[PDB]
Amino acid sequence: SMEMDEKDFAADSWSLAVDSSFLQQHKKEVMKQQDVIYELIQTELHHVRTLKIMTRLFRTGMLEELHLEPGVVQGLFPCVDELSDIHTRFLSQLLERRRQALCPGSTRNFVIHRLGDLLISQFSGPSAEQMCKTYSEFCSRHSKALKLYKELYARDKRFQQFIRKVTRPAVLKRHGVQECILLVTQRITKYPLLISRILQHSHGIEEERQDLTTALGLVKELLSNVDEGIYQLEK
Amino acid sequence: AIRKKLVIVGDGACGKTCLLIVFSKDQFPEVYVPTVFENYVADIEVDGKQVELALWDTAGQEDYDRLRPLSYPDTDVILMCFSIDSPDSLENIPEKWTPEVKHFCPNVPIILVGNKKDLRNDEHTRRELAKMKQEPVKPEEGRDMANRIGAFGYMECSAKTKDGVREVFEMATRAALQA
Numbered sequence A: 001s002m003e004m005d006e007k008d009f010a011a012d013s014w015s016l017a018v019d020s021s022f023l024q025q026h027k028k029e030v031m032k033q034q035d036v037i038y039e040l041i042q043t044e045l046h047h048v049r050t051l052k053i054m055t056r057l058f059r060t061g062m063l064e065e066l067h068l069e070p071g072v073v074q075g076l077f078p079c080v081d082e083l084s085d086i087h088t089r090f091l092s093q094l095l096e097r098r099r100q101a102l103c104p105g106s107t108r109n110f111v112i113h114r115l116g117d118l119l120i121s122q123f124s125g126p127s128a129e130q131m132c133k134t135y136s137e138f139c140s141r142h143s144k145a146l147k148l149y150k151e152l153y154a155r156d157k158r159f160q161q162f163i164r165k166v167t168r169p170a171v172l173k174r175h176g177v178q179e180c181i182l183l184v185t186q187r188i189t190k191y192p193l194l195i196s197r198i199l200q201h202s203h204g205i206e207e208e209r210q211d212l213t214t215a216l217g218l219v220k221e222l223l224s225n226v227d228e229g230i231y232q233l234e235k
Numbered sequence B: 001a002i003r004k005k006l007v008i009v010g011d012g013a014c015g016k017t018c019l020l021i022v023f024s025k026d027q028f029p030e031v032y033v034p035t036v037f038e039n040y041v042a043d044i045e046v047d048g049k050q051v052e053l054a055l056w057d058t059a060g061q062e063d064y065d066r067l068r069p070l071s072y073p074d075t076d077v078i079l080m081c082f083s084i085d086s087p088d089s090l091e092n093i094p095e096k097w098t099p100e101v102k103h104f105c106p107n108v109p110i111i112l113v114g115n116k117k118d119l120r121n122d123e124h125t126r127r128e129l130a131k132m133k134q135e136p137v138k139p140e141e142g143r144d145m146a147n148r149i150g151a152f153g154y155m156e157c158s159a160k161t162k163d164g165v166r167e168v169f170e171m172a173t174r175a176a177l178q179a
């Protein structure tokens, strides 16, 4: 992740991210709605950070430092490039929706009034089909990935040393190869919880309440198909 | 420092996300309680042993029976959560959660946790539960459930008042260390 985006979401909430004098001019319900929206983007930033760790630090590190069959790397980190491209476009669209909302002469004060359309475009049509088909793949290969890792760690002393070396920095304390895989698998089940809590504080504009309701039913439709498309592969 | 994995299972609004956020932040969030919990690796020293404890949540996976079991691999301790202000969430402990946690995690120590214990002395909770001919889960019913499901132990806590929270995660580490 980039420094600009890290500081923009370094705060524990939206009410702490903006200036205190800017927050004081808004109704409590607006603050409660923006707090949950901010959390959706903050956790989408952490999700893309996790995918970038798998692709650039683990997956890439293994190809250049260790010399193992590239198919073993494909089995260790399945559909990661595709998942990276899917969420980086989503984070890109979420971050520009925040920047458009910025108060003139400020880099921290903003009020996102339209979010629904963005969620509908993401969780519908070809994007939902590509995401459903990618998450179903990832989750079917999830167990085989954890096993293949445990095997490589219990047999290879150079792979054991590589994992000790890359995961030494404190920033990666909760971000090992296995934590990253479950982190990704659990991401899709977060969206309904986040979209339902945004929807709960979005009964101000009717077209917004209907867009957030359509996106809520659209995420659950995706999750139900992802759940129906899982067939666990053995090692 | 040994690495042991903790997973918290339980019904929808049983308070497992709140419990996890409160413990990982030491305090109850004053300005904003987050909707989701990603993961946390906690440094716990119990009885003179230093352990690194990964914390995981099954919140959001309750409806997706093919996705949910992907949380279970390599689990060393299970926290089976239920809410004290919802006697119907305890009914699903031996019917729904125990058979699943025993199928995917055989021999893994389970601690039955009674969350929201403060709500026992709540007027609004005692009122709404009485309207359905009910009352908050009594400690004897929690102990009797932990006994019937063959749990390692029974513990009560309150994510809101933080009472009992530190004692659960230390005990979870003691169970995870048992081989």
Ligand SMILES: *CC(=O)Nc1cccc(C(=O)NC)c1
Binding pocket: A019, A021, A022, A025, A102, A103, A104, A105, A106, A109
């Ligand atoms: C964009 C911008 O100037 N926002 C802002 C920040 C602090 C305070 C105010 C304001 O209107 N105070 C009366 C606006």
